[PDB]
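Please produce the structure of this protein holding 4WI.
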Amino acid sequence: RKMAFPSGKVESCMVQVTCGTTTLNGLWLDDVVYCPRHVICTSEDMLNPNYEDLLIRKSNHNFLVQAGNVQLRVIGHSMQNCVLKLKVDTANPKTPKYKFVRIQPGQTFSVLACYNGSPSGVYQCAMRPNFTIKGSFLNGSCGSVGFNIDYDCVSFCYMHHMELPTGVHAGTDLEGNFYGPFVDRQTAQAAGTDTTITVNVLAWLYAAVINGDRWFLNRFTTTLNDFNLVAMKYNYEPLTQDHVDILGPLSAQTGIAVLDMCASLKELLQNGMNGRTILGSALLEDEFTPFDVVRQC
Amino acid sequence: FRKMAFPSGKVESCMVQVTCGTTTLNGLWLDDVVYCPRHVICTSEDMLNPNYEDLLIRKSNHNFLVQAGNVQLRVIGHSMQNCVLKLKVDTANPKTPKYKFVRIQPGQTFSVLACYNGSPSGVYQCAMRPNFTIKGSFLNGSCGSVGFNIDYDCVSFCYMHHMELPTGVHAGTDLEGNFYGPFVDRQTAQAAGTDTTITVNVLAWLYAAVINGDRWFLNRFTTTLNDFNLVAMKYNYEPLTQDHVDILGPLSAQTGIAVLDMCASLKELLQNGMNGRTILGSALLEDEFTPFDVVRQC
Ligand SMILES: CC(C)(C)[C@H](NC(=O)C(F)(F)F)C(=O)N1C[C@H]2[C@@H]([C@H]1C(=O)N[C@H](C=N)C[C@@H]1CCNC1=O)C2(C)C
Ligand SMILES: CC(C)(C)[C@H](NC(=O)C(F)(F)F)C(=O)N1C[C@H]2[C@@H]([C@H]1C(=O)N[C@H](C=N)C[C@@H]1CCNC1=O)C2(C)C
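Below is the modeled complex.
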């Protein structure tokens, strides 16, 4: 099953940021608050914003940053790509060890969905190959963040900005650079056709073998190039050299070579499951990374 | 539409490690009491057939090692309440949330904070099954992990983890130490009663699918409550009560689909199957979202 990281370290970093009547969420680390830059927009502004000109008309005293109902005075502001950095007069005493990372398609993370600076729920998400996430976000959720935790260190990888017409979600890394070709303007935008995350399907097949569900293992192997060309005919992502390497631990644990598992997946694509299940599922799951498999055990 | 858990921070601040002899598991530290599964006092041999009152009288306060992070909490008293041990410690938890202990009913959902050696590992959503098991994700050392819900800064603790059945589902207690289901904290093979599907939750999920634009399973037919329940019981679904119909009111109002209309859609799903189609990306009918869960997320 999907498991989110414990969210407590991130909960103590969530604040609300208001400009005029626009309120969204921000992330308070040390004495800086990070939030989506469209907080400075009026509803009419969002249709066609000039962020450089809009930010010129703003001063520190136009920004209301609150931890709960407690105001944190803003003493400086700057724009970095599509995020606003608000320097505040108080360093967050609950700042965790952290870093900012830009993730690849296929990688998973936990989202802490927040409204008015108040955490509401937590769930695991994957970055799709088309650079959207299949999230759960309502009005006011912008500035909610996605993250991973590794031994006391929080790696922030996503800040939420928008919802696309197909119901999927788009946002930035914590340096304000969008994942994908999207822009923070209220104008017609559309996600590209998506694909299946091959490396994660392979990880999930390894998990099935580890648990004794191994009927789909076949007696063939393939080359990575041959597999990549066939996979694309089924709307599956091609594998990178990095994908092969992150499957190494699971390949070692099961004694099933990566390219043997690739050949087994190829048969599943060309012939289906013939009514059978894998880990109880009739569908091939693609939002568990090799790291998620290892973490779950 | 995602299986969303409550933010776990308020509970993380309460998790500690409890050790007795060479048995280690998790405890929940609230004010000056640590609550944990009583089988922490058992050796490996004791667990095969424990007499807990006899085992407990032979322990002293100093046999219990409680660690909150790196700091040990001195145990100054102890008692047993059913299958839960209560350790009085000389230090009150400074981050004790507003909380209550509640016993939940089958079909209700809660968040689990899975912990190992007193340290939180992951958070996920579970339902209490009609047969009083839970389909959790728990490994060695997970005992004393808790399940909870949060309502406006108040934590309602409903579950503490004790054991895994041979089928791979899980059994535990409320925070008064009473098991959900006909199980006991003895290491011996135990089966649960045959499980059933949580009908009111399946209906809430079908409403979530319609809210999200997935309508292929709807039909023009309708049914009475009794005729729906006849088919539901035939397929090992729980009866739908009038209370359930009322609880679904907000979702019927939002979608403009009468509850008994949605029942007729579910009846055909049960009799015809999904024909290789999916609902909200699932090939099976999902029954671990309550109506409240759907309302909160949507
Ligand atoms: C769907 C909405 C049509 C209204 C619009 N979308 C498109 O214009 C697109 F279709 F082009 F994407 C859109 O998201 N926004 C319009 C305006 C901001 C953003 C926005 O309101 N963000 C919300 C943050 N609080 C989170 C949203 C709320 C609903 N669910 C979410 O996740 C910006 C791009 C500057
Ligand atoms: C599966 C195990 C066969 C070993 C046994 N099960 C049965 O004896 C049953 F069949 F009766 F359930 C069982 O769980 N235990 C044996 C012994 C305690 C409990 C136990 O080890 N609890 C663990 C807490 N740290 C959590 C477990 C570990 C694996 N996954 C879990 O969730 C007690 C009942 C006293």
